[PDB]
Amino acid sequence: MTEYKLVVVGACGVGKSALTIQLIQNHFVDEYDPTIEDSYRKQVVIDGETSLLDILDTAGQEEYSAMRDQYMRTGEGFLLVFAINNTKSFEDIHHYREQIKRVKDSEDVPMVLVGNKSDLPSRTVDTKQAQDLARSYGIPFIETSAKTRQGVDDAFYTLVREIRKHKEK
Ligand SMILES: *CCC(=O)N1CCN(c2nc(OC[C@@H]3CCCN3C)nc3c2CCN(c2cccc4ccccc24)C3)C[C@@H]1CC#N
Ligand SMILES: Nc1nc2c(ncn2[C@@H]2O[C@H](COP(=O)(O)OP(=O)(O)O)[C@@H](O)[C@H]2O)c(=O)[nH]1
Ligand SMILES: [Mg+2]
């Protein structure tokens, strides 16, 4: 069976855990201990291909032990998550991109930019700014709400298709 290692990164609070549990469990968690880092496997069919998605929901502390690099480097593709109501989390996207490039030691890693909390009225990051940045990184941009499940399947499945494109090259 085909397996894909997906890693979800982005500032504390953006909804990495909420997105992952929506994908895994089909519902929304209002609280998920912000320190709990774990990976969840889910069998899915995407464009007719059965696969195991192994999803690393990143949390814990900001630290850069060799052990940390070693597990993050197992990621085949990464969701770069910010929250549309949080300007700082959008600023942080550069950091997560660079860290991916560092540990994968490559400039061609499957990534999807994810603009989460789409359900909220308090928007501070324009869709245009997000599309401009994804455009400049050469990667897709998906708007999501972990609360309503908008764009959740799309974010993950698009990342899979990005990994596929990469494996074709
Ligand atoms: C709310 C808790 C949570 O979701 N966290 C805690 C922080 N942590 C993390 N933060 C971080 O940067 C924090 C901000 C952004 C720029 C300025 N700082 C203050 N950077 C990282 C992490 C987790 C460890 N990773 C990391 C380490 C080694 C290799 C990596 C490769 C690719 C991506 C990340 C790597 C850097 C984790 C989590 C936030 C998330 N994601
Ligand atoms: N309204 C709304 N709230 C969200 C969404 N995603 C996450 N949250 C809330 O934001 C908080 C942080 O989410 P969490 O998944 O813990 O963030 P993480 O730190 O990136 O794992 C929690 O109270 C969630 O319920 C979303 O799409 N919409
Ligand atoms: Mg979390």
Side-chain angles (χ1 to χ4, degrees):
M1 213 195 306
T2 312
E3 203 273 340
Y4 295 100
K5 286 168 189 291
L6 318 183
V7 178
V8 178
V9 300
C12 282
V14 303
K16 302 176 295 296
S17 292
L19 280 168
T20 309
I21 294 160
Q22 258 299 358
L23 187 85
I24 298 298
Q25 278 209 147
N26 298 271
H27 86 293
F28 171 62
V29 299
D30 278 299
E31 205 296 351
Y32 183 112
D33 181 336
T35 74
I36 290 174
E37 178 172 277
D38 202 356
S39 108
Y40 296 87
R41 156 181 287 190
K42 188 169 167 211
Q43 194 176 131
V44 292
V45 173
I46 303 172
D47 312 316
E49 177 192 60
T50 300
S51 42
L52 298 169
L53 306 191
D54 202 352
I55 298 176
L56 175 45
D57 175 25
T58 306
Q61 311 306 307
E62 176 174 5
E63 57 67 38
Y64 301 86
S65 56
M67 221 222 75
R68 164 79 82 165
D69 277 8
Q70 264 179 34
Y71 74 84
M72 298 299 277
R73 183 187 283 122
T74 72
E76 294 181 86
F78 295 75
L79 292 185
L80 307 171
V81 184
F82 66 100
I84 62 141
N85 67 323
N86 184 297
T87 283
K88 220 324 189 87
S89 77
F90 185 75
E91 299 166 1
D92 282 350
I93 292 289
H94 175 81
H95 173 67
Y96 304 100
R97 168 113 171 149
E98 302 306 338
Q99 292 306 300
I100 300 161
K101 290 170 61 209
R102 184 172 69 73
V103 303
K104 296 293 296 182
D105 184 26
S106 151
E107 208 141 30
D108 181 31
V109 173
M111 285 177 226
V112 167
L113 181 65
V114 169
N116 189 47
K117 303 215 192 176
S118 299
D119 59 281
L120 286 185
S122 34
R123 158 178 309 266
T124 62
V125 184
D126 305 321
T127 297
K128 194 93 170 91
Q129 291 173 57
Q131 297 168 155
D132 291 350
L133 179 78
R135 192 179 299 108
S136 89
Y137 287 164
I139 70 171
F141 167 67
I142 289 103
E143 308 174 61
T144 66
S145 169
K147 176 187 187 170
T148 71
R149 215 173 192 278
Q150 178 194 339
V152 177
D153 281 347
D154 200 18
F156 288 87
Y157 287 4
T158 294
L159 181 59
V160 169
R161 301 178 183 116
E162 289 300 287
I163 295 163
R164 282 185 194 153
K165 286 197 289 177
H166 174 85
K167 298 163 87 179
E168 285 173 351
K169 283 179 187 195

